[PDB]
Amino acid sequence: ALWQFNGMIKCKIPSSEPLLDFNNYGCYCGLGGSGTPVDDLDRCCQTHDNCFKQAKKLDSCKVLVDNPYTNNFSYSCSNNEITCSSENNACEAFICNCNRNAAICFSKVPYNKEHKNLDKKNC
Ligand SMILES: [Ca+2]
Numbered sequence: 583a584l585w586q587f588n589g590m591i592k593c594k595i596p597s598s599e600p601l602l603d604f605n606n607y608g609c610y611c612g613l614g615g616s617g618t619p620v621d622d623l624d625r626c627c628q629t630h631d632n633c634f635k636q637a638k639k640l641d642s643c644k645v646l647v648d649n650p651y652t653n654n655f656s657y658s659c660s661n662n663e664i665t666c667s668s669e670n671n672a673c674e675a676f677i678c679n680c681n682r683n684a685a686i687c688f689s690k691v692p693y694n695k696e697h698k699n700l701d702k703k704n705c
Contacts, residue, residue: 590682
């Protein structure tokens with residue numbers, strides 16, 4: 583889910599606006615992704631892309647039309663830690679864990695100015 587993935591990175595990074603700061607960064611952070619990741623932040627987004635790829639080949643996710651972005655799920659942010667809820671059914675619980683690992687990865691890697699809006703001739 584986009585707005586829930588947005589909310590989870592703000593849980594870990596209270597000062598950012600993820601849809602401005604982390605959209606269109608490198609080769610993978612954003613819509614699609616291809617080529618070799620340019621740094622570790624970008625490698626966080628490759629893994630996140632691969633994890634939503636996993637979820638699509640899940641039998642459980644198949645009947646879900648509003649796919650890995652508009653479909654939702656439920657989680658909570660409490661003292662800057664993300665908890666995915668047990669009332670999530672199988673597809674949404676896999677999506678919530680994909681998104682939860684991406685937001686922790688984001689908070690743990692250096693952010694490189696030079697890669698924001700990287701020319702996709704580099705990917
Ligand atoms: Ca991507």
